[PDB]
Amino acid sequence: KPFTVPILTVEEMSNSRFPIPLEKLYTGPSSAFVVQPQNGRCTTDGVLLGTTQLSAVNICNFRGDVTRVGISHDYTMNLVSQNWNNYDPTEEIPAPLGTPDFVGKIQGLLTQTTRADGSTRAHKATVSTGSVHFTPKLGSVQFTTDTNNDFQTGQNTKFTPVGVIQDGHQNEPQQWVLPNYSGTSGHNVHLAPAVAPTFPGEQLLFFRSTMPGCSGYPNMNLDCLLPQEWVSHFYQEAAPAQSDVALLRFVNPDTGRVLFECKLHKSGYITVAHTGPYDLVIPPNGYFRFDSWVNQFYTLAPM
Amino acid sequence: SKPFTVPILTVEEMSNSRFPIPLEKLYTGPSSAFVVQPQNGRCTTDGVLLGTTQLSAVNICNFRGDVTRVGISHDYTMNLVSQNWNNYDPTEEIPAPLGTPDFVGKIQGLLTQTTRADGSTRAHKATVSTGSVHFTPKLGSVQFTTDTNNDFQTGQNTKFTPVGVIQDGDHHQNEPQQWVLPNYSGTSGHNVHLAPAVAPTFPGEQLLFFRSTMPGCSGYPNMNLDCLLPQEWVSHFYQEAAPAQSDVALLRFVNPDTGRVLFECKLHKSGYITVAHTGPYDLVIPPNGYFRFDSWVNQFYTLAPM
């Protein structure tokens, strides 16, 4: 089957690490730190990796029943799946699919329905993924909420993420630092691999969004390796990889001109020939086009 | 010419096209008491977007712009901008900005703001009532009720992220009203450039809906939300733009475990599905079931009964 990538523009696509649209393309050096996101990870022949699942609307969502911690404003959620069925901690994934893959404090609304009468309630809530109580691989996470009495036990409860917060500027979130999915009780397991360019003169190409900020002075940059729409495309097509590297051209259909070319690696990330940080300047109708399979030794034209 | 296909994603792997939440189930029911005229999740099979439909579920019922307090109240007017923060053009031939809510109800979420000069941020609970006379997205503004009367700054980028719906009053589940369109220009003018209403016409047929349950945030809301097409199907047809070789695409819903067909349905080229059933029914399906395009047929094709 012939390999292809979607023809959607950058602004028509969704971030694969948080439920927000893509905004722009960025490249920069990343030799000095580990790039190992767990969402937005898929091979070109459609194997999902890490905590990756198929729709952006599920990313950083949590579902379960909740119990108040003491008589505080904090609540423990005992996690269930997207469709309210069992989460199995022995499945060989790092954490439930869609679990946040960065250290930070995510604000949203915790909502609940009482099954017996259909009454509903919602409260502002924050989940700190750097907390010792962030233990989704064990099956639970803890929220700080704006109530100490309103949530009922044994009732379906959902967290919808909205944005990020900071305390003390732009020191958090840390988008390339993975949470400890088992807290202090164990090390992370079954991770999608860290990524790096292996070819001299190349850098990763990132698909960039700005997370909403909800308090303080947060770092709101969020970079993903693949748009969510590419994840879902590769998953469905499952086109065999004929080499380890697919050559893509970013084209302007208004002029037929190629703006730049890049390498899509079979294991699911893109590199460009550039040195230094750079915010790409792209036309509104630009899109990526697969042109050929190449080997690891192909030299890209400078971006 | 390019063969037509639908996605092989399962129902639970897909997203509602009318609110940013996952699909839960397939549902068919009678629609003669309603005008079914949603504006989101509208796309022809050859890839022409209709109504207010755009391409990602994460943008649906989101609003962006700058805000100004209404008097000394807890209400704020948002002067809308586009998704990428560029100016919104009210002269575009659409009913309202793409992604605008297409039902009458009260949507609760968080209104968030960044002050660009110093990177400071803030967020407050907020509700937009889409049946309000101040819901005028086609004119470029909507009004939010918030939990603050002083914290939002003027001239700063502000975003509403939707979460769920609320209800007020002794008549439980009386709102939202998912099949009642808002007045996108309020009292100023009638709605324009709408995607058309859809209805089954063939004897024994009903619409097939892709159904989600909206989170509820207060009161006793009706949380059912039905779309005509999953968001992934919209995106698929838009990209593929496979020509429609007849009025109707015959689909079979298949269990890939057994290869057995569970039911068949008619995907009309203007972008909605009918099935041969009468009455309310949650379809009984295996979780790995998916839709498969089998052949181009016509409006009068008589389906195997559900």
Size of interface A-B (CB pairs under 8 A): 161
CA distances from A29 to A39, A121, A277, A296 (A): 21, 45, 7, 20
From A165's Cα to the closest Cα of chain B, the distance in A is 8
Q: Is the distance from CB of B295 to CB of B48 less than 8 angstroms?
A: no
- Work out whether the CA dihedral A52, A54, A55, A61 comes out positive or negative: negative
Structure tokens at A150: 């309103």
- B221 contacts in A (CB within 8 Å)? 118, 120
CA distances from B201 to B20, B208, B290 (A): 30, 13, 26
The number of beta carbons lying within 10 Å of the beta carbon of residue B125 is 20
Residues B246, B47: Cα–Cα separation, whole Å:
15
The answer to whether the Cβ–Cβ distance between B84 and A11 falls below 8 Å is yes
CA distances from B225 to A102, B15, B285 (A): 32, 12, 19
- Work out whether the CA dihedral A157, A160, A161, A167 comes out positive or negative: negative
Q: Is the distance from CB of A232 to CB of A190 less than 8 angstroms?
A: no
Interface test mutation site (partner B, options A10, A119, A120, max chain B beta carbons within 10 A):
A120
The answer to whether the Cβ–Cβ distance between B112 and A162 falls below 8 Å is yes
Question: Residue B54's closest chain A neighbor by CA?
Answer: A12
Q: Identify which of A6, A82, A109 has the shortest CB distance to residue B22.
A: A82
Residues B143, B106: Cα–Cα separation, whole Å:
11
CA distances from B180 to A91, A210, B38, B177 (A): 44, 34, 8, 6
The CATH superfamily holding the domain B1-59+167-306 is Positive stranded ssRNA viruses (2.40.510.10)
The answer to whether the Cβ–Cβ distance between A120 and B218 falls below 8 Å is yes
Burial A92-120 (b: 16+ CB within 10 A, else e): ebbbbbbbbbbbbbbbbbbbbbeeeebbb
Question: Residue B161's closest chain A neighbor by CA?
Answer: A162
The answer to whether the Cβ–Cβ distance between B13 and A55 falls below 8 Å is yes
Nearest 5°: CA angle at A38, between A33 and A42?
A: 115
Which experimental technique did the depositors report for determining this structure? X-ray
CA distances from B65 to A125, B60, B80, B105, B130 (A): 24, 15, 4, 21, 17
From A192's Cα to the closest Cα of chain B, the distance in A is 21
Question: Residue B160's closest chain A neighbor by CA?
Answer: A162
Residues A111, B107: Cα–Cα separation, whole Å:
13
Structure tokens at A135: 């233990």
Task: Find residue B127's DSSP bridge partners.
Answer: B108, B145
The number of beta carbons lying within 10 Å of the beta carbon of residue B32 is 8
Q: Is the distance from CB of B122 to CB of B152 less than 8 angstroms?
A: yes
Measure CA A83 to chain center. Answer: 20
Nearest 5°: CA angle at B273, between B271 and B274?
A: 140
Q: Is the distance from CB of A43 to CB of A269 less than 8 angstroms?
A: no
Q: Identify which of B84, B125, B232 has the shortest CB distance to residue A124.
A: B125
Residues B50, A99: Cα–Cα separation, whole Å:
34
Residues B229, B18: Cα–Cα separation, whole Å:
9
Provide the CATH topology of domain B60-166. Elongation Factor Tu (Ef-tu); domain 3 (2.40.30)
Secondary structure letter of residue A242 according to DSSP = S
Structure tokens at A80: 């269930």
Nearest alpha carbon to residue B253 among B290, B222, B217: B290
Q: What are phi and psi of A232, to 5 degrees?
A: -70, -35
Residues A163, A267: Cα–Cα separation, whole Å:
29
Distance separating the N- and C-terminal Cα atoms of chain A: 29
Question: Residue B98's closest chain A neighbor by CA?
Answer: A12
Domain B60-166 in the same topology as domain B1-59+167-306:
no
DSSP letter for each residue of chain B: -PPP------GGGSB-SSSSSB--EEEE---TTS-B--SSS-B-TTS-B-TT--S-GGGTT-EEEEEEE-TTSSEEEEEEB-TTSSBP-TTSSSSSSTT---SBSEEEEEEEEEETTTTEEEEEEEEEETTSTT-BTTTTEEEEEES-SS-PPTTS-EEEEEEEEE--SSSTT---BTTS---TTTTSS---SPPPPB---STTEEEEEEEEEPPEEEE----EEEESS-HHHHHHHHHH-PPPSSSEEEEEEE-TTT--EEEEEEEETTTEEEEE--S-EE----TT-EEEEEEEE-TT--PPP-
Which CATH class, in words, describes the domain spanning A1-58+166-303?
A: mainly beta
Residues B93, B203: Cα–Cα separation, whole Å:
35
CA distances from A14 to A226, A230, B9 (A): 9, 10, 18
Provide the CATH topology of domain A59-165. Elongation Factor Tu (Ef-tu); domain 3 (2.40.30)
Which residues are within 8 A (CB) of A122 and not within 5 positions of it... i.e. 6 or more apart? A109, A110, A111, A112, B108, B125, B163, B164, B215, B216, B217, B218
Q: Which of residues 189-218 of B touch A (CB under 8 A)?
A: 215-218
Q: In this complex, is the C-beta atom of A107 within 8 Å of any C-beta atom belonging to chain B?
A: yes
From B204's Cα to the closest Cα of chain A, the distance in A is 31
Q: Which of residues 238-297 of A touch B (CB under 8 A)?
A: none
Residues B32, B23: Cα–Cα separation, whole Å:
24
Longest Cα separation, chain A: 65
Nearest alpha carbon to residue B55 among B274, B305, B291, B235: B235
Domain ranges of chain B: 1-59+167-306, 60-166
Q: In this complex, is the C-beta atom of A54 within 8 Å of any C-beta atom belonging to chain B?
A: yes
Amino acid found at A6: P
The answer to whether the Cβ–Cβ distance between B57 and A57 falls below 8 Å is yes
Nearest alpha carbon to residue B138 among B70, B196, B188: B188
Nearest 5°: CA angle at B166, between B164 and B171?
A: 145
- B164 contacts in A (CB within 8 Å)? 109, 111, 120, 122, 160
Q: What's the length of chain A?
A: 303
The two beta strands, A157-165 and A213-216, are parallel
